[PDB]
Design a protein around this nucleic acid. Sequence first.
DNA 1: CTCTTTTTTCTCG
DNA 2: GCGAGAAACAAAGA
Length: 271
Amino acid sequence: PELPEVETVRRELEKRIVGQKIISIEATYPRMVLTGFEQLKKELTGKTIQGISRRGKYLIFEIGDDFRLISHLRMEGKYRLATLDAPREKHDHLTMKFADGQLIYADVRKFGTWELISTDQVLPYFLKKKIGPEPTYEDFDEKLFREKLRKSTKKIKPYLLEQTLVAGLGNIYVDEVLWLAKIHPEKETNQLIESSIHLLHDSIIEILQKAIKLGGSSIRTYSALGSTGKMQNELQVYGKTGEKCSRCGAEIQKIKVAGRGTHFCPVCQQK
DNA sequence: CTCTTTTTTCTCG
DNA sequence: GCGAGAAACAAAGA
Ligand SMILES: O=c1[nH]c(=S)[nH]c2[nH]c(=S)[nH]c12
Ligand SMILES: [Zn+2]
């Protein structure tokens, strides 16, 4: 998932599990708890969920007075809220059991991670990850964004994917944002003129906020949180190889950029 | 059978 | 420091 999908999961968890006492925690894949599963089980059993936050693509469970469980879903992580008798599924790894259901974390590729840290370690934790600003008008300052672009010879798509200019874009939304802003993904950022940077800045905010509003992009679903999204019906380029661009009618092309599949309109996004 | 495809962090030169 | 490539892992498609 990308930021909009994580925000959608965050919102459903906030509505459904805040106030719930963790009755027990179990793992079939304890090694994905980077701070130690047995330690986490000892610390969090019996505590109540107070809130769910997010920073970039990271989910943050606020548990008890002092605990923060930082969860990253990476490529394929999925949470679901299940009955206590729900059958095990093959790629389920962890579960937090409440009195009237359980929150199960599943992840085919096993990339996702859990880290238990304290409240006052959250801000230093994200500083150490070098996460950039949230993609909002209030936090995403165009002036710094522009100065960083002007200094760099990096290509715009890999630089945006670093999470350092702005947090939350992944392969789907960076391709959508670049199409919307009419920027070729291989453009060196120091070649972007001010008006292109302005359009890019606004487009990042607008695309991600639209995606949040539509509940993220779910291709297929299953019973998982976040699976009722509608943003996939709005994608203009991602996964549209060979289809016609909706602005100019040229076929969308797919290339590889810094090892990522990359979809763009060659007319609208001039090299 | 092989090769390729689908977020973060590392090695290597 | 950089970029290229690959690793972590599993599955599906050519
Ligand atoms: O954290 C990241 N750092 C880099 S350098 N590239 C990249 N691409 C995605 S998606 N996430 C990240
Ligand atoms: Zn076009």
